[PDB]
Symmetry: C3
């Protein structure tokens, strides 16, 4: 039942608020319905990035999840996650892409095995 | 109609030209037929990498796009992108991998929603 | 026949042993049956990450391969790779995810073309 969220951004590290990784863990566990134990978060600041040819603040993100991915769900995750990047990192939501991936359990390794 | 291009390389940051992300943005806009506003670019230098067991300059890259991905198009993008990586980052084209992803609009978040 | 392996971890760079990239290359070549010349490896230490909300050592990894991906094969790769991360980076196997991707040859660029 794993899920993992990565955010890559040109915002500097010092502008990522204390607790951001915990907030992402908590809110993604609520949004996906998964226990927080199985949510992993990876935040990558200070990146060399451009969005539409502008180097103003932006983010490129991915959510990989075993299940809980689909049309309506992804719209709800995007409202949640773009809102968090706007409020916490001051990145405009129209300068964020988030790619969503529904992983088959047999294609996710954990603890010397897979979830298949 | 988003697209995005990521380059991970062991070439040092000082060797990535200041104009490289703009050059990639413009050349990918032309190659995909998309307005440059829709293209995001991310360059990640100074990485700990090996390609075929050697740590000479190399790159591992990804192009994710809503449409404009397919057998013939991907052959053409590989020539474009190997040319840019060879000239601007001094990477031999046989030390470049590019993974191509045709993303469904429902699986790309932007601006608080998805493109579906 | 390309394959590539990426490990992202919060373990510090100084904790990644000399020879780790070579060990990954050789062990993956053996595991996948591919010649090492086709294997790329990418290790990303010092990352800002959490797994289950905790920032104890963890890793998020990916193996992309043209073929040699499947249920039993991925279980075997997970035992190998978690074992290497435990022995070499001191990361607990229950704090590792590895995502496996079977890439179509037409979607992997190399040297001015694709593998199709
Ligand atoms: C030069 C040769 C040994 C060679 N190096 N190499 C590195 C990565 C991926 C493929 C290849 C390859 C090939 O034989 C082509 C035809 N697949
Ligand atoms: Cl679930
Ligand atoms: Cl934090
Ligand atoms: Cl999958
Ligand atoms: Cl679209
Ligand atoms: Cl080697
Ligand atoms: Cl070398
Ligand atoms: Cl998709
Ligand atoms: Cl070889
Ligand atoms: Cl199998
Ligand atoms: Cl182990
Ligand atoms: Cl594919």
């Amino acid at each position: 039942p794993a899920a993992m969220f990565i955010v890559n951004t040109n915002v500097p590290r010092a502008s990522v608020p204390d607790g951001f990784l915990s907030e992402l863990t908590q809110q993604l566990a609520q949004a996906t319905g998964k226990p927080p134990q199985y949510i992993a978060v990876h935040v990558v600041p200070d990146q060399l990035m451009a969005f539409g040819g502008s180097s103003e603040p932006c983010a490129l993100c991915s959510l990989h999840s075993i299940g809980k991915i689909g049309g309506a769900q992804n719209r709800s995750y995007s409202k949640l996650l773009c809102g968090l990047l706007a409020e916490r990192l001051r990145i405009s939501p129209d300068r964020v892409y988030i790619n969503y991936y529904d992983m088959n359990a047999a294609n996710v390794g954990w603890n010397n095995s897979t979830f298949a």
